[PDB]
Amino acid sequence: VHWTQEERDEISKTFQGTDMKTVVTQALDRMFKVYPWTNRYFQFRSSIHAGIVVGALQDAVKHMDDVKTLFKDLSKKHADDLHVDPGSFHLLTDCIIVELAYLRKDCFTPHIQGIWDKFFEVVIDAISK
Amino acid sequence: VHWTQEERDEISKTFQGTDMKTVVTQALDRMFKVYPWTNRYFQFRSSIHAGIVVGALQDAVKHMDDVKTLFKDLSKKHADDLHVDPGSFHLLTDCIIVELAYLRKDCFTPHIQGIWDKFFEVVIDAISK
Amino acid sequence: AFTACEKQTIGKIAQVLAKSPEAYGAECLARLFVTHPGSKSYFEYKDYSAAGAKVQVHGGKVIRAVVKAAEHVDDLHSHLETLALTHGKKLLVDPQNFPMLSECIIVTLATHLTEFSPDTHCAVDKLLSAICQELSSRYR
Amino acid sequence: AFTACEKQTIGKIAQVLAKSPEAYGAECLARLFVTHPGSKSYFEYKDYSAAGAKVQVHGGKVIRAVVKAAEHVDDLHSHLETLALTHGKKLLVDPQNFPMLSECIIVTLATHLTEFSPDTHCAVDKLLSAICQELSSRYR
Numbered sequence A, B: 001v002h003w004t005q006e007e008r009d010e011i012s013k014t015f016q017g018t019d020m021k022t023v024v025t026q027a028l029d030r031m032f033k034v035y036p037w038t039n040r041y042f043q044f045r046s047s048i049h050a051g052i053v054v055g056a057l058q059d060a061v062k063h064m065d066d067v068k069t070l071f072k073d074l075s076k077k078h079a080d081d082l083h084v085d086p087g088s089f090h091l092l093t094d095c096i097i098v099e100l101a102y103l104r105k106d107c108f109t110p111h112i113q114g115i116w117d118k119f120f121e122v123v124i125d126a127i128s129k
Numbered sequence C, D: 001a002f003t004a005c006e007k008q009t010i011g012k013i014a015q016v017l018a019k020s021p022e023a024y025g026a027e028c029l030a031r032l033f034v035t036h037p038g039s040k041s042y043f044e045y046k047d048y049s050a051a052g053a054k055v056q057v058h059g060g061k062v063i064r065a066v067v068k069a070a071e072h073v074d075d076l077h078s079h080l081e082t083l084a085l086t087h088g089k090k091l092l093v094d095p096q097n098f099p100m101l102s103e104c105i106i107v108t109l110a111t112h113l114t115e116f117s118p119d120t121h122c123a124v125d126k127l128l129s130a131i132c133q134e135l136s137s138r139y140r
C-alpha cells in the first residue's frame, strides 16, 4: 500500500514505546459497552485477550508490507468459526484509536490519526475474508 | 478466488443469451430512484452508460479468475477521480440482482442468487481500492 | 414520512404477503442463509432450506410482523418497541444483519410480484429500512 | 429517548463545545478530510486543515448545530427538518459520510476532555447517532 518512511516509524515506535496491552484492553472494554452486540461474539478476560490481539498487531508491523498473508488463517477463524461480521471489525480498531487519542491528547493530530486510520484499514482488509 | 464450473456456466450463459445492456440500464435508473444520493456522482444517459459498464463486466467474465488486476484502473478512477464511497458500489450491483431476479422470476432460486452475489461480491472487491 | 401514494402501493404488497406468510417468509430467510452464512449462527435449526419446518414457521412470523408493521407506518416506534427490545437487548443481533434480510425480502418480492418498478421498490425499501432502524435501536 | 443520565453528560459536553465551536469544528472536519478524502468534494476549500479560514467558519456552524441539537434531544425530528432536507434533498450527501464525521467528532472529544469513559462516549454516540439518522431521512 506504500508506507511513507514516517508512517512506518510512527507505528513501530508506538508498539515499542507505548503500553499497547492496556490500550487494547481498554479498547475491548469500550467496544463492549458502546457496541453491545459485540459481547454476543464472546460467549475469557479482556486483559488476557488484549495480549493476544496486540500480539497479532505486532507481527503485523513486523510484516507491514505483507499483512494479508500473515493474517491468512487469522481471518478464517474470525469467519468460519466465530462468524464475526466483516463490517464489525472496524468497531475494535476504531476503539483502539479513541484510546490512543485519549492518551496522546494534543499530540494525536489529524495527520497522525490518518496514519493509524491507514494502518487499521489494511489490518481490517487482511483479517476480513 | 475459486470458481466452480457451475458458477462459471451460470454467469457465462447470462452474458451470452440475456440482454445485460437492458438489465444494467434499468438497474441504473432503479439505483437513481431508490438511492437518490447516487445521482450527485453523475452531474449523460444510463442507456448509453449501461453499455460501458456491461463492457467492463463482460470483461470480468472473460477473466473471472483475476478481476482485481483487471480493474486496477477502474478502481483508481472511481476512487480518485469520481470519489465514489467504497460503500456505495453494492448499491448498483444489488439493483442488477433485483433486475435479474425480476427477469428470471422463480427460476432465480436462493442458489442462483448466491452465485451472482458471489460474482458481484468479487467485482466489488476488484473495484473498491 | 410516508406519502399516500407510498402507503397505497405498500398496502397492496402486504395484501399479497398476508395470503401465504409462511411461503414468502421461508424464502426470505433461506435466501439470507445462503448468501450470508454467518446469519445461521442465530438460529439452531436442523434444516436451513425453505423446506425446513422452523424456517417456515419463523418465516411466517417475520412476514406477519412486516405486514402488521405496514398498518402502523404512522407509529412504528411504539409499535415495534417489544420486537426491538427482543432483537436488541435480548438476542444481541449484530445490526449488520438487518439490511441483509431486507435485500432478501426485496429480492423475493422481485421474484413473485408481477410488477416491481423503481417506484414500488423504493416504497418497500422505505418500509423495511424504517422497520430495521427500529429493531437496531434498543441494545440497552 | 434519552435517560436523565445521558442528558446530563450530554449537557456538560455541550457547555464545553460551546466555548470554542470554530476551534472544535475545524478539528473535526480536518480529521474528516484526512481520513475520508472523498468527503473533500462537497466543499470548495483551498486549505482543508484546521487552519483553513473556510474550514473554521463551517466547523463552527457544525458544532453549534450539534450543541443546539443537544438542547432539543426530546424532539429532534422536527428540530432538524430543515437541516435534514439540506443534506438529503439539496446537497445529496452520501449517507456513508455521516458515520465518518461522527467518529471524527468523537476522536476530537477524546483528545480534549480530561475524562472520556465508555459511559460518556455512549451518550455522545447516542446523540450523534440520532442526529445523523434524521439527517439521512429526507433523501426519499
Ligand code: HEM
Binding pocket: A038, A041, A042, A044, A052, A053, A056, A057, A074, A077, A078, A082, A084, A088, A089, A090, A091, A092, A093, A123, A124, A127
Ligand atoms: C481487526 C482487529 C482484530 C484483530 C487483529 C483480532 C485478533 C484476534 C486474534 C489473534 C485472536 C485469537 C486467534 C486464535 O485463537 O487463533 C482473536 C480471537 C477472537 N476475536 Fe478477534 N480480532 C479482531 C477483531 C475482532 C472483532 C471486531 C470481533 C468481534 C466483535 C472479534 C472476535 C473475536 C473472538 C470472539 C475471539 C475470541 C476467541 C476465543 O476466545 O475463543 N475479533 N482475535
Ligand code: HEM
Binding pocket: B038, B041, B042, B052, B053, B056, B057, B074, B077, B078, B082, B084, B088, B089, B090, B091, B092, B093, B123, B124, B127
Ligand atoms: C461495481 C460496479 C461498477 C462498475 C463495474 C462500474 C463501471 C464503470 C465504468 C466501466 C465506467 C467508465 C468510465 C471510464 O472508463 O473512464 C464508469 C464510470 C462512472 N461510474 Fe461506475 N461502475 C461501478 C459502480 C459505480 C457506482 C455504484 C457509482 C456511483 C454510485 C458509479 C459512478 C460512476 C461515475 C460517476 C462514472 C463517470 C461517467 C463518465 O465516464 O463520465 N459507478 N463506471
Ligand code: HEM
Binding pocket: C039, C042, C043, C061, C062, C065, C066, C083, C086, C087, C091, C093, C097, C098, C101, C102, C131, C132, C135
Ligand atoms: C426485517 C426485520 C426483522 C423482522 C421484521 C423480524 C421479526 C421477527 C419476529 C416477529 C420474531 C419473533 C418474536 C417473538 O416470537 O418473540 C423474531 C425473532 C427472532 N429474530 Fe427477527 N426479525 C428481523 C430481522 C432479524 C435478523 C436480521 C436476525 C438475524 C439474522 C433476526 C434474528 C431473530 C432471532 C434469532 C429470533 C428469535 C426467535 C427464536 O428462534 O426463538 N431477526 N424476528
Ligand code: HEM
Binding pocket: D039, D042, D043, D061, D062, D063, D065, D066, D083, D086, D087, D091, D093, D097, D098, D101, D102, D131, D132, D135
Ligand atoms: C453529522 C452531523 C452534521 C451536522 C450537525 C451538519 C451541520 C451542518 C450545518 C449546520 C450546515 C450549514 C447549514 C446552512 O446554514 O446552510 C451544513 C452544511 C453542509 N454540510 Fe453538513 N452537517 C453534518 C454532516 C455532514 C456530512 C457528513 C457532510 C458531508 C461529508 C456534510 C456536508 C455539508 C455541506 C457540503 C454543506 C454545505 C456547506 C456550504 O454551504 O458550502 N455535512 N452542515
